[PDB]
Design a protein around this nucleic acid. Structure first.
Ligand SMILES: [Mg+2]
Ligand SMILES: [Mg+2]
Ligand SMILES: [Mg+2]
Ligand SMILES: [Mg+2]
Ligand SMILES: [Mg+2]
Ligand SMILES: [Mg+2]
Ligand SMILES: [Mg+2]
Ligand SMILES: [Mg+2]
Lengths: 86, 205, 137, 91, 143
RNA sequence: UUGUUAGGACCUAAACUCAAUAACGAAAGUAAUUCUAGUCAUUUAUAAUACACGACAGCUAAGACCCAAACUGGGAUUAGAUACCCCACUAUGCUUAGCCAUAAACCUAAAUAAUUAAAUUUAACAAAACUAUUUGCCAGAGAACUACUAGCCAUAGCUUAAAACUCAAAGGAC
């Protein structure tokens, strides 16, 4: 309300591709976490539930990264059988 | 079936086998060489290379047959074609030169164009939802659309005719009356389409 | 020598002009997309109202008032009123995150208005008012 | 037989020979369709040659090794060998 | 205990199921209109016919409007199903419903049929207007 | 009433991202910014009948009041709705003074110093096991977060806490 208007959250349309501008603005507002914030802020999440949710996300992200690491660590060993017949 | 699944339907087209080799598309050319190493089903009793054999009329004959009496059903269709040819010959001779041009005296061409005029584009399949009968607009295949035209003709003549009239005389009068798009069978097609329009909203169900 | 997604900077000199208008002058299309009704208002850069529309005024009612096709009609209606008043280029500030958020912008394009930019003004409090309690269903 | 304790001395004795052939061809270094209208022997026929029960995985692995032998340069000894495991398709 | 935790190897219903079905459809439609679920899911531009929750509440079936191309539909099916487990999370986390059933994605080719009928219908010719267990037998010599 | 305002006023309430962080505090608890005051050495463990604290809800008095919201009213829903869903609104959540002293007040782990081998899965599951030291506490279940007693700003309250009588189980982990 005190800042300058049209600098924040503003994308510019290139060659009349109005849909591409909107679709990019969505990817911006989602990468920055504004989309999740607006959705969650519709109803009150109680402090105990917020902490349970954030602790679960962190442990969920750690387990998904390590499991990807194990799969990607053995991505190179998946090759044609060198010892076919034995 | 007594034919193993490896058996192939026979091809009874006289011109196809005698065509020059170069005139055949490579897809058709491939099938010929393949069929040399396959099993071929024996041809049916009603399958011949005759130039007078029409598949549409042959199908119409079987849909009239009762209890395997093919001789009678074929006789009725033969009498029908003749009854239509004789009805157009009378009209042609008793018409002016200008009118004579339009008059069609080929029974095979009146039969095909009659059936086509009675074929319905869309259909109605009756469904039951929530304890009521909601029939909904449906689209019909080329096989279902043709069957309905033939079935509606064989049923108008069988039922809605005087007691002493015969099928060759009622069917001839309907193929010609349908051929002009004014028969009762045409009304059956019109009623099917008009109901589908009414049930446009119920298509979702 | 490439296109810039970032808008022109107010108070500077730019080569971007639309119909002989600078960016600060192009009229603004304010879209309030809520979960029930999508309202649209078009104003000049001096804050003078030119067109107004919404799913309700078009004639949609209750749950239909909050559909994508309902908002599209509202945008086409606002475009026509704006086009009559003499508007060809609009800056789209879309508040709200409802179903007709995009459809309202699509209707404005179908109505003959040329969108040059899309801004977002969805209210995001920084810590604010306690939201209503969660629904139990 | 030195492969007795494997439990399939005849299957593995054959897979030992074909794997040694493959190694000599690969170390040492034309059209491979010397024979046409032929098929690989079915598992039942192979089991008869070995005189021992084989599984589907054992048959599938045996064929892959024989295919690799054909891919490589083959002297007349190899062609005669793979011939034993090729049965003329019924005509 | 992370590995232990996340391995995870081991008339009332009528009115309740007319609210969950409506709300779940309202909510899942919003989820797919943004990249929140994924960028792949956002680009598919999928539409939802309706949501049907089972009477047992074992599963939540979401009907999405299938298209013409089988390849387009086969791709959309795989992407939608892989993310269904994640979509359920987002609905519990925004507090749409406290408990949500496993989401299943079913195809809805009905929208194609309705378009076909209207095509033919416009073109149609309407026409003119203990004993055994115990050792007693063993210890007596009977056995 | 609504929408817009690069108009004005207000300074109520709460502190996005950072935070995928794991800091501070005895615990309760604490994360908008700045500044002021401020945590610190007892060898270590070991304390009540004393002292000082103690989420939320609640009580008392004077204020505040954006938003939320027991209760209450309205609307719908249903065989019934005394609920769930929708609208309005109050106690209350805030401040200033007291009071009350309750939580799954939980890391369901007393503190402290060891050791990792004692051929210890010494049940199982949690959180690998185990020695020593000091204090508190426990001795089948139900009756019983009860009765009586004493203390307390507490008066439908908290702490302390039995017996009769009944059963042959109750209970825990897989
Ligand atoms: Mg304040
Ligand atoms: Mg200081
Ligand atoms: Mg109040
Ligand atoms: Mg705990
Ligand atoms: Mg108590
Ligand atoms: Mg008591
Ligand atoms: Mg007492
Ligand atoms: Mg006792």
């Amino acid at each position: 309300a005190k800042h300058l208007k049209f600098i924040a959250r503003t994308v510019m349309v290139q060659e009349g591709n109005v849909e591409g501008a909107y679709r990019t603005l969505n990817r911006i507002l989602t990468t920055d976490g504004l989309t999740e914030v607006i959705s969650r802020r519709r109803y009150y999440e109680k402090p105990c539930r917020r902490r349970q949710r954030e602790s679960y996300e962190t442990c969920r992200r750690i387990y998904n990264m390590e499991m990807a690491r194990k799969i990607n660590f053995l991505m190179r060993k998946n090759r044609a059988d060198p010892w076919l017949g034995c | 079936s007594r034919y193993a699944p490896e058996f192939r339907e026979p091809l009874i087209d006289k011109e196809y086998y005698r065509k020059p080799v170069a005139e055949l598309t490579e897809e058709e050319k491939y099938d010929q060489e393949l069929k040399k190493t396959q099993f071929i089903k024996a041809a049916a009793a009603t399958e011949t290379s005759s130039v007078f054999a029409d598949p549409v009329i042959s199908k119409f004959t079987n849909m009239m047959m009762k209890g395997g009496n093919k001789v009678l059903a074929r006789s009725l269709m033969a009498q029908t074609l003749e009854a239509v040819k004789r009805k157009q010959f009378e009209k042609y001779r008793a018409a002016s030169a200008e009118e004579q041009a339009t008059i069609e005296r080929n029974p095979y061409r009146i039969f095909h164009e009659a059936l086509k005029n009675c074929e319905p584009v869309i259909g109605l399949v009756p469904i039951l939802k929530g304890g009521h009968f909601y029939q909904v607009p449906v689209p019909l295949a080329d096989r279902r659309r043709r069957f309905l035209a033939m079935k509606w003709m064989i049923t108008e003549c069988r039922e809605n005719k005087p007691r002493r009239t015969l099928m060759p005389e009622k069917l001839s009068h309907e193929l010609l009356e349908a051929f002009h798009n004014r028969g009762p069978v045409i009304k059956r097609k019109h009623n099917m389409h008009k109901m589908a329009e009414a049930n446009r909203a119920l298509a979702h169900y | 020598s490439r296109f810039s997604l970032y808008p022109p900077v107010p108070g500077q000199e730019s080569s971007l002009q639309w119909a002989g208008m600078k960016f600060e002058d192009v009229p603004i299309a304010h879209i309030k997309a809520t979960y029930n009704n999508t309202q649209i208002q078009v104003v000049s850069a001096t804050n003078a109202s030119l067109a107004r529309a919404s799913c309700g005024t078009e004639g949609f009612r209750n749950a239909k008032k909050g559909t994508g096709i309902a908002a599209q009609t509202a945008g086409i209606a606002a475009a026509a009123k704006a086009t009559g008043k003499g508007v060809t280029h609009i800056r789209v500030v879309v508040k709200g995150m409802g179903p007709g958020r995009w459809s309202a912008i699509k209707g404005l394009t179908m109505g003959g208005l040329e969108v040059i930019s899309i801004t977002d003004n969805t209210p995001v409090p920084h810590x604010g008012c306690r939201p209503r309690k969660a629904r139990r269903l | 037989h030195f492969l007795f304790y494997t439990g399939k001395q005849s299957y593995y004795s054959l897979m030992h020979d074909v794997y040694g052939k493959v190694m000599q061809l690969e170390k040492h270094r034309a059209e491979s369709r010397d024979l046409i209208g032929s098929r690989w022997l079915i598992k039942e026929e192979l089991e008869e040659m070995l005189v021992e029960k084989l599984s589907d995985e054992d048959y599938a692995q045996f064929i892959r090794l024989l295919e690799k032998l054909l891919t490589l340069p083959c002297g007349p000894a190899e062609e005669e060998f793979v011939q034993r495991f090729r049965r003329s398709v019924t005509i | 205990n992370l590995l232990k935790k996340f391995a995870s190897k081991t008339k009332e219903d009528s009115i309740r199921l007319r609210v969950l079905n409506g709300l779940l459809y309202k909510s899942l439609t919003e989820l797919l209109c943004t990249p929140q679920v994924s960028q792949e899911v956002y680009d598919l531009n999928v539409e939802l016919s309706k949501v049907s929750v089972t009477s047992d509440f074992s599963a939540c079936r979401v009907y999405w409007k299938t298209g013409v191309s089988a390849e387009q539909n086969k791709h959309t099916e795989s992407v939608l199903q892989r993310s269904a487990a994640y979509m359920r999370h987002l609905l519990i986390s925004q507090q749409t419903l406290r408990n949500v059933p496993p989401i299943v994605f079913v195809q809805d080719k009905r929208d194609l049929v309705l378009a076909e009928v209207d095509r033919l219908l416009a073109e149609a010719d309407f026409g003119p207007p203990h004993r055994d267990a115990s050792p007693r037998s063993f210890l007596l010599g009977e056995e």
